[PDB]
Every structure is written in structure tokens, then in C-alpha cells.
């Protein structure tokens, strides 16, 4: 994954890396999860252009449907940890988290999110994510 991260400076080969992820998919789950976490970190860096980040997020959302429950839960926990760290400055991570939540312990996940303290200057992005995936009657209150 580190080599792919180094090679994805231009952003042209990242799609080929996704094919490599497919080569991982058909050991595979852990490599895919690590690649997803590193891609989330790279998008959080913000160095990549808007179009490349949008295409990468779309491809990741499309590919996340086939992933198993354990990898999805691990990615959700990592996203919650990143939100607690408050190092997010783009809505692409919010869209990815919304897609992961839509794929679907979900009630416990949103309850734990509710118990947490929000980071100022990211409340609008949290609201964007919440309208992306609606909550229940009691959690929304």
C-alpha cells in the first residue's frame, strides 16, 4: 500500500491500483482496508485536485458494496476516530462515510457518535453527512 501511495502523486495510476485492489479482492480484506484507510488519509491531506479526489471517492463508494461486514465496521471505526481527531477538511470523507453507512450495530454506531463532542468549523460537514444518511426518531432528537 505504501508503494501505491507513493506512486499516486500524479493520480493517473490510482485506478490501476484499484485493479490491484481487485487482485487483492479475488489477506485480501486486510490489504483492501489498509488501502482504503491510506486513501482516506491522502484525501484528508487535500493535495490532490478536486476532480481526482471526486473520482477516487466515487470509485471507493462503488467498490465498498462488495466488501464484507468486518472491513466495513473497521472502516467505520477508523472514520469515527478521524472525526474525533478533527483532521477533516473536505466533504469527500463525509460522502464516503455516508455510503458506508448506507451499506450498513448501526444504532450503536450512531449512539456512540451522538455521545461524542463535535469539532467546531466541521458542524456543517456533519450536518451534510447526516442529511446524506437519515437517522432514527430517537437519535435525531
UniProtKB/Swiss-Prot annotation:
Post-translational modification: Monoubiquitinated by FANCL during S phase and upon genotoxic stress. Deubiquitinated by USP1 as cells enter G2/M, or once DNA repair is completed. Monoubiquitination requires the FANCA-FANCB-FANCC-FANCE-FANCF-FANCG-FANCM complex. Ubiquitination is required for binding to chromatin, DNA repair, and normal cell cycle progression. Monoubiquitination is stimulated by DNA-binding.
Record-stated family: Belongs to the Fanconi anemia group I protein family.
Free-text function comment from the UniProt entry: Plays an essential role in the repair of DNA double-strand breaks by homologous recombination and in the repair of interstrand DNA cross-links (ICLs) by promoting FANCD2 monoubiquitination by FANCL and participating in recruitment to DNA repair sites. The FANCI-FANCD2 complex binds and scans double-stranded DNA (dsDNA) for DNA damage; this complex stalls at DNA junctions between double-stranded DNA and single-stranded DNA. Participates in S phase and G2 phase checkpoint activation upon DNA damage.
Subunit structure: Homodimer. Part of a FANCI-FANCD2 heterodimeric complex that binds and scans dsDNA for DNA damage. Interacts with FANCL. Interacts with MTMR15/FAN1. Interacts with POLN. Interacts with UBL5; the interaction promotes FANCI homodimerization.
The protein's name in its UniProt record: Fanconi anemia group I protein
Organism: Gallus gallus (Chicken)
First-to-last residue of the parent protein present: 30 to 192 of 1338
